[PDB]
């Protein structure tokens, strides 16, 4: 599960809401640990 | 991170070259459909 907001709220260009800033836990080298990863995804790859 | 402004990806195609190329395609299609027909190009229908 990813928690996402728009990458640029200010932008009014045609590319509005296409890039989303998503946060997720993913995994680490060790089984017992987790991290927090922030990354950008395109709207076409992410479904609500 | 996206540095600078967020911009839309796009292609530039010269209008005159495309118009001449398409006209040539129309002439060759007329050879199979007739000299008194109308050839219309339109956008692709909805789908993936």
């Amino acid at each position, epitope marked *: 599960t990813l928690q996402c907001t728009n990458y640029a*709220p*200010k932008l*009014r*260009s*045609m*590319m509005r809401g296409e890039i989303k800033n998503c946060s997720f836990n993913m995994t680490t080298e060790l089984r017992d640990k987790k991290q927090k990863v922030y990354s950008l995804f395109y709207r076409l790859d992410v479904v609500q | 991170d996206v540095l600078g*402004h967020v*911009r*839309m990806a*796009h292609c530039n195609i010269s209008k005159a070259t495309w118009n001449e190329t398409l006209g040539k395609v129309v002439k060759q299609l007329r050879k199979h459909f007739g000299n008194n027909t109308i050839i219309r190009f339109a956008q692709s229908s909805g789908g993936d």
Partner: antibody, heavy 128, light 106 residues
Framework: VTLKESGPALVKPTQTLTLTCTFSGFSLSTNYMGVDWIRQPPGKALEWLARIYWNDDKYYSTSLKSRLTISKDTSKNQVVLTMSNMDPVDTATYYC???????????????????????WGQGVVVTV | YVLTQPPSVSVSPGQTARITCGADNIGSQSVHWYQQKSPQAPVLVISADTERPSGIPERFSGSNSGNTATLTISGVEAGDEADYYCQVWDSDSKYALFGGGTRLTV
């Protein structure tokens, strides 16, 4: 970038007000700059009236949609604002100003930002 | 969507004044700031929250986040006090919305 307003000083009730703003240093439909109109009643904050963009787009304040009309003539380097049914409450200093847009990408994709009103005219005072 | 400004900010000479402009989700739109002294058209002091137009003293700065936009003017002198206004162009409704103005007092 100079803008100069002209119009009547005295307006009768119900009379239509006409304001003309002449541009110097820029022109519409050549560059990507727009022009709008703002009014300021005496002792009150500025009230936005309406805007015209370089691409013939026209926008109006929701309070004056039934009364305010604007037009552009690029051969004269002029913009005209008109308002029907002028009322005593409409006494104000009227200004025209240049809407400067910062363009970084493709205009077809609206790749620009509203930079604000950097250059204003001097305005006229209209009393109804 | 309404832009709410304080009616005034009163400061000592040289003290920093904070002129705010609140509205729901103001941090999602660019806020312009203007300075009006004499009954003449105002001069733009802040462009898109963080850009200082050329010719404006370094005393002028600002930011915009959440529900509050702020104009910070450090080093206030007798020559700076003015009625300051916030303006936002709302692309969603395609019109410019103006605040009520804030008067500075030295």
């Amino acid at each position: 970038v100079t803008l100069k307003e002209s119009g009547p000083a005295l307006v009768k009730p119900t009379q239509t007000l006409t304001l003309t703003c002449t541009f110097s240093g820029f022109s519409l439909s050549t560059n990507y700059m727009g022009v709008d109109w703002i009014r300021q009643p005496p002792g009150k904050a500025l009230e936005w009236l309406a805007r015209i963009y370089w691409n013939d787009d026209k926008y109006y304040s929701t309070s004056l949609k039934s009364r305010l009309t604007i037009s552009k003539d690029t051969s004269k380097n002029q913009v005209v604002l008109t308002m029907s049914n002028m009322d005593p409450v409409d006494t104000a200093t009227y200004y025209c100003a240049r809407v400067k847009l910062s363009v970084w990408g493709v205009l077809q994709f609206f790749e620009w930002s509203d930079y604000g009103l950097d250059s204003w005219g001097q305005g006229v005072v209209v009393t109804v | 969507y309404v832009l709410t400004q304080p009616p005034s900010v009163s400061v000592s000479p040289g003290q920093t004044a904070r002129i705010t402009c609140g509205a729901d989700n103001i941090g999602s739109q660019s806020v312009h700031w203007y300075q009006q002294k004499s009954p003449q058209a105002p001069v733009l002091v802040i462009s898109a929250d963080t850009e200082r137009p050329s010719g404006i003293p370094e005393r002028f700065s600002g930011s915009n986040s959440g529900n509050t936009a702020t104009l910070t003017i450090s080093g206030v002198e007798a020559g700076d006090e003015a009625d300051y206004y916030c303006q936002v162009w709302d692309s969603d409704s395609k019109y410019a919305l103006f605040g009520g103005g804030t008067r500075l007092t030295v």
